[PDB]
C-alpha cells in the first residue's frame, strides 16, 4: 500500500529477473551443487577453479543474494533461506531463461497477429534438452520407473517421441542391455545433443535418432524400423499433438505405425484451471503463457482422459506428479 512498499516490491521484481536467470546459470556452471555440498564457497576460488570472469561471478552471486537464495559474507557465498527450494526447481528456471528466454523477450513482436506466420519466435533447442534431462529425473522419474517396472515384459526395441537429450533411451538401455533404441525429434539442436551423448556414453551402436515430426509419424523417414518397436515413450510433448481431433488422429497413426508396441508411456504437464493469479506456483505461468505465445494448445488433464479410447488406446494406469504444475504419466495399452 505505501509508496515505500511499492518501491521495494518493484525493485524485487527487477532483481528477481536477474536472480532467475542466474539460477539456471549457477546450476549449469556448477555453483549450486558446490553450495549444496559445502554450504558455502569462496567466490574468487570458484572463479579461478572454473576459469570464469570473476567480476561477473560476483554479480551472479549478488543476483542470487538479492532475493535470499544466497547470503554473501565478505568473500564468502553462503546458502540462503530459499536455497533448497530454488535448487530443487533449478531446471525449471533454466528452461524459462536459458531455454525459452528469446520467446518471452520478444513479446512485443510475438503478440501482433500480422507477425504470426512461419517462424515467428525462437528458442534454444539444446538448452531445453539439457534442462529437460533434469526435469525428467527430478519430476517424472519415480512415475516413469514405476511404469517401467510394471511393464510385464522385457522390451527389445524402444522408440522415444521427442527424444531431446536422448537420456531416456540411454537409461532404458542401461536397464535392458540387449535393447535397441530409436529417438525421434523435430529439432536439430536436440538430435545433435543426443548423438553426442550416446557416442560419449558408449551406446552409439544401440541407439539412433531421426529428425521427424511425430505429429505426422507415417511421414517419418525411419518407417521400416517402427515394426520392431515393442515399447513406446513420449515425455513433455504430448500437448503438441493437440487440439483434440489432431491428437486423436495422431494417436491412431502411432497405434498403426507401431503395431508391436505393448505399452506406451506418456508423460506431460497439463493446463491448470482456477488457480489465483497471486497463488500461481512455480512453472505453471511460464508453461501456459509460453505455449499461448507459441500458439500451441495445452490440454487439461480432463481432456487427456477423453482421447485415448478414440485414439485406439486403453489407459491402464495414471500417476500424479508432485509440484510440476499439474503433471501426469499415463500407461497406455
Ligand X SMILES: Nc1ncnc2c1ncn2[C@@H]1O[C@H](CSCC[C@H](N)C(=O)O)[C@@H](O)[C@H]1O
Ligand Y SMILES: C[C@@H](C(=O)C(=O)O)c1ccccc1
Q: List residues near ligand X by CB under 6 A.
A: 125, 128-129, 132-133, 136, 162-165, 168, 184-187, 190, 213-215, 235-237, 240
Mark the breaks in the chain: residue after which each occurs, C to N over 2.5 Å. Answer: none
CB of 304 to ligand X, least distance (A): 17
Torsion angles phi and psi, residue 126, rounded to 5: -70, -45
Site for Ca ion in 99-118 (CB under 5 A): 102
DSSP-assigned states of every residue in 129-151: HHHHHHHIIIIIHHHHHHHHHTS
Distance, in Å, from the CA atom of 287 to the CA atom of 92, rounded to the nearest integer, reads 10
> What's the rounded Cα separation, in Å, for the pair 115 and 14?
28
Looking at the DSSP assignment, which residues form a beta bridge with residue 4? none
Indicate which of Ca ion, ligand HF2, ligand X, none lies near residue 302 (CB less than 5 to 8 Å, by partner kind). Answer: Ca ion
Q: Determine, following the binding rule CB under 6 A, whether residue 319 of this chain makes contact with ligand HF2.
A: no
**Which residue, 219 or 246, has its beta carbon nearer to its own copies?**
246
Q: Do residues 260 and 227 touch, judged by C-beta distance below 8 A?
A: yes
Stretch that binds its own copies, among 21-29, 199-207, 212-220, 306-314 (CB under 8 A): 21-29
Should residue 135 be labelled a site residue for ligand Y when binding is judged by CB under 6 A? yes
Question: Residue 124's binding partner, choosing from ligand Y, ligand HF2, Ca ion, none, with beta-carbon cut-off 5 to 8 A by kind?
Answer: Ca ion
Q: CB 97: neighbour CB atoms within 10 A?
A: 21
Determine which residue in the list 140, 163, 308, 329 makes contact with ligand HF2, applying CB under 6 A.
308
Residue 230 interface partner, choices ligand X, ligand Y, ligand HF2, none, CB cut-off 5-8 Å depending on type: none
Q: SS in 3 state form for 179-203?
A: CEEEEEECCHHHHHHHHHHHHHHCC
| Residue 234 interacting with ligand Y (CB under 6 A) | no
65, containing H or E segment: helix 54-65
Q: H/E/C letters for each residue in 242-283?
A: CCHHHHHHHHHHHHHHCCCCCEEEEEEEECCCCCCHHHCCCC
Looking at 89, 168, 180, 215, which residue binds its own copies (CB under 8 A)? 89
* 285, 310, 312, 317: which one binds its own copies (CB under 8 A): 285
Residue 78: strand pairing partners: 40, 71
Q: Fill in the per-residue mask, 288 to 307: x = in contact with ligand HF2 (CB under 6 A), - = not in contact.
A: ----------------xx--
- In the set 268, 271, 307, 329, which binds ligand Y (CB under 6 A)? 268
Each residue 269-308 as x (binds Ca ion by CB under 5 A) or -, in order, gives: ---------------------------------x--x---
Task: Answer yes or no whether residue 317 interacts with ligand HF2 by CB under 6 A.
Answer: yes
Q: Does 190 bind ligand Y (CB under 6 A)?
A: no
Nearest to 151 by CA among 120, 187, 176, 169: 176
Please give the grid coordinates belonging to residue 263: 505399452
Minimum distance from CB of 140 to ligand X (Å)?
7
Interacting residues with ligand HF2 (CB under 6 A): 304-305, 308, 315-318, 330
Interacting residues with ligand Y (CB under 6 A): 95, 128, 132, 135, 236, 268-269
Amino acid at each position: 500500500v505505501s509508496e515505500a512498499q511499492a518501491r521495494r516490491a518493484v525493485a524485487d521484481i527487477f532483481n528477481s529477473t536477474l536472480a532467475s536467470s542466474a539460477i539456471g546459470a549457477a546450476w549449469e556452471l556448477g555453483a549450486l551443487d558446490e553450495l549444496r555440498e559445502n554450504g558455502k564457497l569462496d567466490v574468487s576460488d570458484f572463479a579461478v577453479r572454473h576459469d570464469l570472469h570473476e567480476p561477473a561471478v560476483v554479480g551472479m552471486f549478488t543476483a542470487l543474494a538479492s532475493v535470499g537464495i544466497v547470503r554473501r559474507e565478505g568473500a564468502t557465498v553462503v546458502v540462503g533461506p530459499y536455497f533448497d527450494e530454488a535448487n530443487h526447481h533449478r531446471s525449471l528456471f533454466h528452461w524459462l531463461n536459458q531455454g525459452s528466454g528469446e520467446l518471452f523477450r520478444r513479446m512485443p513482436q510475438v503478440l501482433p497477429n500480422e507477425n504470426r506466420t512461419g517462424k515467428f519466435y525462437q528458442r534454444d533447442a539444446g538448452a531445453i534438452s539439457y534442462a529437460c534431462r533434469e526435469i525428467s529425473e527430478r519430476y517424472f522419474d519415480p512415475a516413469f520407473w514405476a511404469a517401467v517396472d510394471g511393464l510385464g515384459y522385457t522390451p527389445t526395441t524402444v522408440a522415444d517421441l521427442g527424444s531431446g537429450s536422448g537420456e531416456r533411451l540411454i537409461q532404458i538401455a542401461r536397464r535392458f542391455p540387449g535393447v535397441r533404441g530409436l529417438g525421434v525429434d523435430i529439432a536439430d539442436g536436440a538430435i545433435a545433443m543426443a548423438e553426442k551423448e550416446v557416442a560419449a556414453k558408449g551406446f552409439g551402436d544401440q541407439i539412433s535418432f531421426v529428425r521427424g515430426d511425430a505429429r505426422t509419424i507415417d511421414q517419418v523417414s525411419a518407417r521400416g524400423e517402427f515394426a520392431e518397436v515393442d515399447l513406446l515413450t513420449c515425455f513433455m510433448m504430448g500437448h503438441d499433438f493437440w487440439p483434440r481431433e489432431n491428437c486423436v488422429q495422431t494417436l491412431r497413426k502411432l497405434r498403426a505405425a507401431f503395431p508391436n508396441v505393448r505399452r506406451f508411456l506418456l508423460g506431460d504437464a497439463t493446463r491448470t484451471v482456477g488457480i489465483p493469479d497471486r497463488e500461481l506456483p512455480v512453472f505453471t505461468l511460464g508453461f501456459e503463457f509460453g505455449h499461448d505465445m507459441m500458439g500451441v494448445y495445452l490440454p487439461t488433464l480432463d481432456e487427456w482422459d477423453g482421447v485415448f479410447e478414440e485414439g485406439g488406446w486403453r489407459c491402464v494406469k495414471k500417476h500424479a506428479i508432485d509440484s510440476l504444475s499439474v503433471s501426469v504419466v499415463f500407461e497406455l495399452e
